[PDB]
Amino acid sequence: RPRLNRLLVLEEAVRVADGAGGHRLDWQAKGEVWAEVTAGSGSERAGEFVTLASVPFTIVVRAAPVGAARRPRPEQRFREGARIFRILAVAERDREGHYLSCFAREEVVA
Amino acid sequence: RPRLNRLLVLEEAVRVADGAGGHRLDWQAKGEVWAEVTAGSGSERAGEFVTLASVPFTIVVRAAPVGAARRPRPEQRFREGARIFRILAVAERDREGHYLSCFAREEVVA
Amino acid sequence: MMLNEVTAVPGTALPVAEFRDHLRLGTGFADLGAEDAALLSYLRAAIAAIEGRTAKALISRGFRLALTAWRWGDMQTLPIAPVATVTALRLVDAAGVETPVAAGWRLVPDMARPRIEALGAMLPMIPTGGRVEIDFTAGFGASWSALPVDLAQAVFLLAAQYYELRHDGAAGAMPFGVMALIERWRTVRVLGGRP
Amino acid sequence: MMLNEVTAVPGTALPVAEFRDHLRLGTGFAGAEDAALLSYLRAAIAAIEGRTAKALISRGFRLALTAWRWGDMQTLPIAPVATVTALRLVDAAGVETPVAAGWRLVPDMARPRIEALGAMLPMIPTGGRVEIDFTAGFGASWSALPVDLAQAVFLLAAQYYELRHDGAAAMPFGVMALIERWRTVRVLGGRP
Amino acid sequence: MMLNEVTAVPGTALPVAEFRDHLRLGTGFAGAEDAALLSYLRAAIAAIEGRTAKALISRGFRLALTAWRWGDMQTLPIAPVATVTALRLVDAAGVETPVAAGWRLVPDMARPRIEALGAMLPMIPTGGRVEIDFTAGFGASWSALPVDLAQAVFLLAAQYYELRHDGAAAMPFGVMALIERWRTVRVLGGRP
Amino acid sequence: MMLNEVTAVPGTALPVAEFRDHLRLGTGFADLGAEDAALLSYLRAAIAAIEGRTAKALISRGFRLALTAWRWGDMQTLPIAPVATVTALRLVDAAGVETPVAAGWRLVPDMARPRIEALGAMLPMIPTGGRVEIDFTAGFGASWSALPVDLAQAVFLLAAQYYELRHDGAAGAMPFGVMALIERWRTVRVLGGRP
Amino acid sequence: MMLNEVTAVPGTALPVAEFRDHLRLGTGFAGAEDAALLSYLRAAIAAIEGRTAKALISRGFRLALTAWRWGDMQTLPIAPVATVTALRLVDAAGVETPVAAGWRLVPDMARPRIEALGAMLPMIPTGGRVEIDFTAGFGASWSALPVDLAQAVFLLAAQYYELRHDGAAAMPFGVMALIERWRTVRVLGGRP
């Protein structure tokens, strides 16, 4: 079972729509959650015109029912200081449902 | 052997045909089945113009003979509330035939 | 001492609609009854498995204890433990012609040792070459809702392992397992002797 | 000695609402209807009131026995007792005549015992065995229980719920380590 | 002492239809023809009626023995007996003269025994050994069996079906734990 | 000797706001209270689990020791260990009409053996068919901040394992675990004898 | 014999600033607020001052006991003592009269004991048990401790922080091997 040792700020961006059918993201902070972060094999990735530096980073938080603020959704992101962990999906580790699997990237531009 | 703990609504869509050779899907609910859901490694997937968020989610139900309503077919889907689990195939886990392997995606648009 | 039963459990008294909800089979289908001949077939095989380990009866059917010689002087313990209202004590002879006898026998009701306990210092005498049939209805209650629930939970824990595995396949028992629930309903006897 | 109870517990006194807050709340998914849960708490109360010889909801019993043990005793088996209602003393047929004096109930968690006044206890007729109706248990509700005994019911009824047949999976204060202090500790296997 | 049976069980009294409802029904696929299944139930009845010394379908036997054990005894080995048909007492060649008095069958699951009236039992001529034909067993059908004994036949005939040679794979009430209470418990290895 | 308590812990005295910070649940959400009926439900189940292993009280509620016969001549040890200010020693008779007695009883305060210790060489005499109710407030302190902190840490180590696993699932204990912290608060008695 | 302390330690004397320099500094990330850390050091001081019978911050105690052990003794349990303040000797009601002569405190880490002058020690009235207030401990600050005892507090309070419930994970000088030389070694379980 996980050792939730690291503190991560959950961040949901409120989506103000613009004129052309898109939205605007500002990323205000939601509450702070504790989670363990487990790195996978990391390597460079050909970005757009950047040489990014990605790592898999499976993140384990505690769970919640789906209509609650303590559930990280995949449109959210984590942040430890200035390290932006994205969220790819959440996936319910245990059989009983105590913990979740977040999946990050944390791609600094290298 | 599985611990069937989670409740999932089996859903078969009745297929009303339209004029141009296709069908129309409405997804009325079939009966409720109990099943364990086991997440695989999840990550984002390039959708059509969406950034989807998929997870493998092997789902284990009890079995039935093929001409029965308790068999999930691959044209059906599960639903826990508003979480649409698709069905990719069913594949008969045990040697004796007590349980099945459903395979889901559960791709929220992230 | 034969101890065969007069009638059996009717099958309508067994909680197949609740044992189906125990097995987590399926709720809202149009089928919903494909195992009623099967779910009832393992409830009868797990009640009668626990009736042999605990010497209980659980449904309160009517029994008949056909024996030929009284064991002791006056008491005559009955094998099946929870007893109530011994229907008839008949005293047969060499050929048929059974005559019922009130007989001064009285049935102390106790789930420790269910016995008859003759009150006239002797049980009524058996003729030479003749039987004694004690007709009694032993068990907890007429329906399933009258059982002690720890014993009724051991039936569902056991009949679900006859369902979920068909041939004898080996499976660490849980704190209060199947064996730990029926082990306060067993008979604790320490007499191997002549009296 | 039979000790059947008078009335079963209604189910509206059992915490089927507080059990699912133990079962899936805080961590999990906000599964089964109340008739499935209530079949597991009373299957876990009756497993602990049999191992610890308790009652936990305080329903009424009837102890009908045929011979007293001593003449200043006959300890009662169900442990937390209060307010022995009547000491009926039937004859054979039983016009059912009660007695109303001679004994004192001694409320004690160790030996709930009936301890007649002086040295003589009410004797029993030939065939007319004496019955005692008493109301043993902690409290009428669920909130009157000792909480460690009420937790071990929830730790066990969540075991009967979350795993159905006798399958595989000891923690420091488990189910056994919580009910080991409510069990009856006796070392007399002797004549008296 | 031979104890051959008179007639075998027909197979129309064996539940070849109810065995496949144990075997693949409820969970599985709705495999083999009736002659393959029926070869496995009577191979599992004869494994349990040999371990528990029972009969289970109530066919007729013939016990032909040459010397009685006591003069008020000769317990019969096949346990659930009813209606000893005849006590034939052949001579050497055997014009085959039956006797019709002197003994009482005592139906008892413990010691099914023949217990002659008084103190003298029908003696045996020189060479003309006595035969007993009796009909031992629970009931003529399959629905008259004890269900735990009938389940352990199905738990064993599904073992002989689902795995063919002596290969690899104990559950609480298994095959052995169900037939351990129908076996004969004797502790006389002595002279009488 | 019944030893039931008069009042229980009010629930406002339990550190749910600190046990929430122990569980590492979540800090700045708009919800922040979805487990207040749950986090308090396992603090009461881990205080009362340690009160049964150590015979302590930890919140200093008021108790009542209803007994019928004094155990020894003069001392009468109390079960719950940390005692202070025995409120009333009443001496009831056959039916009601309780009369309080100062009674020359004095309560030696000690966490080893909390006893009464009659100073007039005999405890006050109990009437035939009458009880004795000792009303006392036993425990460490009125709030949570008055507990010994090693015992209060064992409550958080234990109530967090009732939170993090709901059914009885087996989990090497840490140097100062749950059992190693309460094992200097247990009662160390070696008398199985008549006096 | 109670031995309650007079005043608790303030928390401004505990090193909540030096604990996080043990906890995450040099190797790690530069996590929780001071009220979460300070709840773990005093939960680790009180685990070691109970196993080693020490005091570590030098707060004031009050030992109130009802009978002296000898007449030239009564060793004090909390080990590093200095400056027994007063020997109050209350009567029943207690106008609370102190005594000021007759005894000498003997500061000793082995047996901190009170050792009256001569052969007679101040006797106790009937009901008026004697109380001793003393200030036992190493020093008023944290920098006056033995450093191996102060390290085993940090090795244990970092255990209570970095793993929350009673979960899984012995090194040469661990927590146990550091406090094994501050514990009281006594082999008298006898009458005196």
UniProtKB/TrEMBL annotation, chains A, B:
Designated name of the protein: Head-tail adaptor protein
Species assigned in the record: Rhodobacter capsulatus (strain ATCC BAA-309 / NBRC 16581 / SB1003)
Automatic annotation (TrEMBL), chains C, F:
Source species, domain of life: Bacteria
Protein name (Swiss-Prot/TrEMBL): Gene transfer agent protein
Species whose genome carries this gene: Rhodobacter capsulatus (strain ATCC BAA-309 / NBRC 16581 / SB1003)
From TrEMBL, chains D, E, G:
InterPro entries: Phage_CHP
Gene3D superfamilies: Phage gp6-like head-tail connector protein (1.10.3230.30)
Domain of life (superkingdom): Bacteria
Protein name in UniProt: Gene transfer agent protein
